[PDB]
Homo-oligomer: 164 residues x 6
């Protein structure tokens, strides 16, 4: 029983960690699609795919969880997008998404789609995180320590302020 | 330290497993670049990228090993291919390859490149394992049991036979 | 003589039918270009290239026109676009378009470009048709019965409402 | 019921014409996929997609049949190729092909795949027709008259001879 | 010593000329990256790469300057964009740009990056030029004569006005 | 009066130098298309586009010529190639090639095409030069000294011998 979720994870935060813990109550293994994999060094997408993969893996590695952090390019072709994801991932059974498009594409191919729970959405939000990194407000408590680590290694806050 | 190897892994086999254990005695973490990610459904590359990530993760999940199985697509552009691999992966320090083009691209970018030891190459080689699959000889002792399970799940031997 | 027209046809409607009837009075054959062929599943482009080819072909098949419905992707490259379109289509003599870009690229290559007559544009427009599909007003009498048929087969109205 | 065949058709010949008339006794409509769409001006692929559309449509306008001559690019990605073919084509139910790859991809997605009959393959062959066109032998009896006509209009034999 | 600058040059105006003469006081040769090289026939990007190379060349040829006008496509992948640029260009030692993204990408690759001086930026700006071309407000005394000559050969002002 | 020639220049050798001096007696300016611009680090294409631009510009800068060394990518689409080449380059009138595909593509668009003169074609050939580099014969006296110098900066012979 595998599940799939997809996000940009810029960065992976504590709401992601919670929803993955919840989904790991329902399914044996979780595929973690890293969308917009080619997008990096922008204000919405500050981090590369390999940065994201490192954040995610370093966050989840001591949990008793089988997961697959897989980079998925933006391709501009919605009608083949489910097959493109399938090409790159282990077979899976359930998709967790609240996004109208991801839900329509997967349901027309016969998959089950479920809406995940949101946890503390006024704080646990890439958009809100990046906004605090830019304005000097105190964001480290919003993501896993492993992500803090990574963001320091690559100087990601500095990157984001330079790009602004 | 982080190490880098790249192969097609069709399929991951006991010689890979051995070379990766040996690598891990040099370096803290290993990036496993899955090459020709887009090539599947052929006699030389039967399995999809996603099929390969499943095989590799199921084989290794086992060990006290931090590794990152990351699909890299054939791009036709040798001069930016180190950059492309660097976009998709955690920062790495040492490249294990005997392949002359991989070696030349990495060395010209300032990376140290080592040859890995071969283990038992007359059996442990994807070409030899695929040939055995096609003709109905035993191959399952040549890969980790977790690979045997995967190949059964995805009906990999039947695909090969049909393609032939 | 062969005329060329290009639109997105989401969906093909009675205006498109009339303007093609008008054009087949001037030229022996018509190439129907189906623009933005890779776009689908969006409120502006709900339907795939294949669904549009089916709509168009099922509308025009009883009419005794020779016509070629040909899918044309969005490429990002206006300077080569005429050549792209010429690669995919019979040789043609006249383009009918009132689009300033289509018009400019064809004229720079030496083609004759003519404006097509508009029929009943406050009703005969994909925008106004998708808008009624969405907001529940009747739209069936604005397209050919074959198009109503195809949209039923594929449940395109539900698709659109789910995407909104 | 819709059928699906795929070839390169350089050019469309009387073997195709007969394989299609035969298919048309099993199914209501037939999607003709024109494979290698972007390949032209070579000795194996002299003719552009649009030149093949014109040939195939002129040959068949003739008959009491509904067909869909649809250009399909060579994408280098076998895992997504059925989806890609599905994005560009009306829904179909049966695939006629003896090609071992096409047969696998379709069967893995649930489709029924049948071998078409061959007719007179030692003459009715693109390869043998191209050979005759280059060396000044009679080839006009091997294709529809509609084809010959197209070949004259685009000067295809002259092309092929200068390429050689 | 070799300097790099990048712009769209639609069109090269006197602001450009002066910033290049300045840079030439620091460096022996100047690579002029003509970016967005595939973008043309739009109100932001009116001219082709080949047109911009002929504007830029005709404007510098009688200065004592060694330069290299080299078209650079928009790729959608920031992370490998310095390697791409390096692929197409002679090796350079200093980058002049005040664009933050350009600056961040080249600084993470260890290059020295310097802001160029602005000259007369209310008149000497492509956006202002194209807006006068479009309004009938005047423009030729904002770019080199050579750029005027060119904009006349190709009829660029008419093009822009038809696109509007 | 501008002339166009296209080759891979790996590397630019004394036959290239002659044939371009010849062509410069017939035409006011020469566009040197550097084909296979993305191909590098192979035995047929050792050098990157920017490496070849450097070779070609070092070789000619002390002669009389007006020229434009412009990188052209291998696209895989013969029917649009002439338009792609036109996007990238100043307008040209005369094409010098003895290649049958280059010739056909351009004569089908109405261009005059002429065969250039061979000079010293047993020595003055990329193939022969690379072959000497790789088995140890002398090659310097076959290419201009400015090319020798470049091949030494970038250690071009070492790269080639490593790739073999
Ligand atoms: N009502 C009409 N009468 C004649 N020509 C029409 C009519 N409506 C559309 N066309 C046109 O057909 C082509 C564009 O079709 P397209 O499907 O994109 O049109 P639309 O109805 O305007 O769609 P949309 O509102 O979704 O943008 C152009 O030739 C345009 O002239
Ligand atoms: N706080 C949260 N609680 C539960 N799931 C969440 C939460 N935040 C995001 N997700 C899930 O993560 C995936 C979207 O990841 P994504 O990168 O878009 O996150 P985000 O927090 O919305 O960031 P952004 O503001 O940058 O868009 C979706 O599956 C969404 O369900
Ligand atoms: N038996 C082996 N022992 C050690 N390393 C191996 C062995 N087989 C392959 N490798 C290596 O793993 C990578 C090669 O991966 P790949 O799957 O492409 O090899 P392969 O088994 O030789 O495959 P194939 O026969 O399908 O080409 C390189 O690092 C090469 O060193
Ligand atoms: N003589 C024939 N009789 C029946 N079907 C044919 C014949 N030749 C080709 N086909 C069919 O057409 C399709 C392949 O078309 P394609 O254009 O590749 O034909 P071809 O004649 O084999 O060309 P080529 O020699 O140039 O490779 C397949 O479905 C194949 O069965
Ligand atoms: N007026 C100016 N004076 C000095 N430098 C300028 C001026 N305008 C632009 N630049 C510089 O030239 C390059 C920008 O070129 P680009 O074509 O993008 O410029 P632009 O004049 O801002 O055009 P546009 O408004 O269309 O975006 C950069 O190196 C930038 O520093
Ligand atoms: N010895 C030569 N004398 C004259 N022209 C030449 C000579 N060699 C090549 N050319 C010309 O240069 C262009 C071919 O460039 P290209 O770099 O492909 O040449 P090449 O020397 O044949 O290389 P290669 O062997 O690597 O294919 C053509 O326009 C051809 O006319
Ligand atoms: Mg979000
Ligand atoms: Mg191998
Ligand atoms: Mg419109
Ligand atoms: Mg064939
Ligand atoms: Mg600007
Ligand atoms: Mg040659």
């Amino acid at each position: 029983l595998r599940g799939f979720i997809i996000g940009r994870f810029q960065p992976f935060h504590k709401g992601h960690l919670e929803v993955i813990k919840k989904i790991a109550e329902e399914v044996d293994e979780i595929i973690i699609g890293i969308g917009s994999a080619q997008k990096s060094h922008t204000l919405e997408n500050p981090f590369t795919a390999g940065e994201r993969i490192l954040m995610i893996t370093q966050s989840l590695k001591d949990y008793d969880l089988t997961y697959y952090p897989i980079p998925i390019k933006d391709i501009e072709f919605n009608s083949i997008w489910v097959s493109y994801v399938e090409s790159l991932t282990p077979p899976f059974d359930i998709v967790y998404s609240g996004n109208p498009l991801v839900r329509v594409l997967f349901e027309e191919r016969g998959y089950e789609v479920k809406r995940p729970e949101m946890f503390n959405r006024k704080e646990y939000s890439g958009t809100e995180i990046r906004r605090r990194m830019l304005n000097g407000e105190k964001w480290e408590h919003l993501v896993p320590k492993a992500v803090v680590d990574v963001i320091k290694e690559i100087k990601g806050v500095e990157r984001l302020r330079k790009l602004a």
